[PDB]
Amino acid sequence: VNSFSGYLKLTDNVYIKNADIVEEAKKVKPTVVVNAANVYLKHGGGVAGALNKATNNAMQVESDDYIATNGPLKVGGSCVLSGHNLAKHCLHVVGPNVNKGEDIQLLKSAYENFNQHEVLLAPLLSAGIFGADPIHSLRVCVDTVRTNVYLAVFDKNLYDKLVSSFL
Numbered sequence: 112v113n114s115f116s117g118y119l120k121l122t123d124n125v126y127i128k129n130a131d132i133v134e135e136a137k138k139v140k141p142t143v144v145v146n147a148a149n150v151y152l153k154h155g156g157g158v159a160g161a162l163n164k165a166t167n168n169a170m171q172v173e174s175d176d177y178i179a180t181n182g183p184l185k186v187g188g189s190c191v192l193s194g195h196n197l198a199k200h201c202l203h204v205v206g207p208n209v210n211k212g213e214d215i216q217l218l219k220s221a222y223e224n225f226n227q228h229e230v231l232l233a234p235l236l237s238a239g240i241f242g243a244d245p246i247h248s249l250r251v252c253v254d255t256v257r258t259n260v261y262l263a264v265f266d267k268n269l270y271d272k273l274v275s276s277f278l
C-alpha cells in the first residue's frame with residue numbers, strides 16, 4: 112500500500128492521474144519524484160521550471176553544483192539529487208527533445224532509468240514542450256518501466272485523450 116490517490120490503473124505497474132506533479136509531490140512526499148530535465152539541468156520551463164520554482168530555486172542551486180563537478184548528462188541519462196521540500200529524492204531524467212532535433216529513439220533509454228527505483232511519481236517523458244507524441248511516450252513507458260510508476264499529467268484534455276486511446 113502507498114499514499115497515491117485517485118490514479119487510474121493502466122497496467123500491473125503503471126497508474127495515471129490528471130494532476131499537477133508539483134501539487135502531487137507536495138501532498139504525497141514520494142520517495143522519488145522524476146524531473147523532465149535537460150542535459151544541463153537548467154530548470155527553466157515545463158515540469159523542471161515548475162518543480163524548481165516550488166523548491167525556491169534550491170533545486171537549481173544543487174543542480175549547478177552537480178554540473179560544475181560532473182559535466183552534463185546524456186540524452187537518455189539521469190542523476191539522483193535531493194527532492195528538497197517535494198520528495199526524498201529527485202530523479203532528473205533527460206528524455207529526447209524533438210524541438211531541439213534529438214533522436215526520439217532515446218525515449219526507451221530515458222524510461223529505463225525508472226527501473227532503478229521501486230516507486231516513482233513522474234511526468235510523461237518527451238511530451239508537452241519536449242515535442243514528442245504523448246500517446247507514444249505512454250506506450251514506451253508501459254512497455255519499458257517494470258517498477259511502480261504514478262504518472263501525473265498536467266493537461267486535462269491530454270489526460271482524457273491518453274486514457275481514451277490507451278491499448
Ligand SMILES: O=C(O)Cc1ccc(Cl)c(Cl)c1
Nearest residue numbers: 147157158239240264265266
Ligand atoms: O503533463 C503534461 O501535460 C504533459 C507534459 C509532460 C512533460 C512536460 Cl515537460 C510538459 Cl511541459 C508537459
